[PDB]
Amino acid sequence: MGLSDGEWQLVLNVWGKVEADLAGHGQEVLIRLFKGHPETLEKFDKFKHLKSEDEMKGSEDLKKHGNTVLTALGGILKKKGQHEAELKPLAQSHATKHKIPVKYLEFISDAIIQVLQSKHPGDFGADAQAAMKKALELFRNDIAAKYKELGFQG
Numbered sequence: 001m002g003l004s005d006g007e008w009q010l011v012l013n014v015w016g017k018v019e020a021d022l023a024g025h026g027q028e029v030l031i032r033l034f035k036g037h038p039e040t041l042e043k044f045d046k047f048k049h050l051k052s053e054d055e056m057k058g059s060e061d062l063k064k065h066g067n068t069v070l071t072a073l074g075g076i077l078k079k080k081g082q083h084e085a086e087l088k089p090l091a092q093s094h095a096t097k098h099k100i101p102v103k104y105l106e107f108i109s110d111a112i113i114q115v116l117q118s119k120h121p122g123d124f125g126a127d128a129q130a131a132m133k134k135a136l137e138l139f140r141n142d143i144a145a146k147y148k149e150l151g152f153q154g
């Protein structure tokens with residue numbers, strides 16, 4: 001489950017690229033998510049009326065939640081596995097209010113990796129792709145344990 005020190009440095013390096021525009025990257029992520037797995041959009045009461053992609057792209061709220069989403073994941077990844085404090089709140093809201101099953105967390109993880117590969121290939125080689133996958137996998141897994149405690153079967 002854990003990542004080596006070098007694997008984390010691969011994650012932090014490609015992140016450094018995402019940092020310059022979190023809202024724009026988060027928008028792309030969510031658009032891949034909704035486009036590859038349309039069922040996830042029903043979870044979003046505000047974004048649900050969005051139809052095509054260009055519809056999703058001119059939504060200013062969508063881009064702000066993109067920022068919301070990657071702001072929080074950034075804080076998680078920069079802890080390099082020591083993210084208990086940061087997962088506490090995210091788990092609570094995604095296991096009670098929102099009810100986000102873990103496979104939708106897998107969807108969005110794939111989305112993230114698709115966006116990074118598309119936008120920053122020079123900073124996202126084979127081992128950084130693997131490292132980020134494990135990082136998000138370690139994220140999903142520790143959330144899932146929190147889900148258990150909270151009474152959610154994701």
Ligand code: HEM
Binds near residue numbers: 046090
């Ligand atoms: C890396 C994965 C994710 C991160 C870091 C993340 C983070 C957040 C944050 C910070 C919020 C606002 C504060 C809060 O609710 O705690 C939020 C809200 C929300 N999340 Fe997530 N999220 C993730 C994945 C997902 C996925 C995959 C879905 C749905 C399939 C989802 C559904 C929602 C919804 C519906 C809200 C309410 C937002 C609103 O309507 O304003 N989340 N998420």
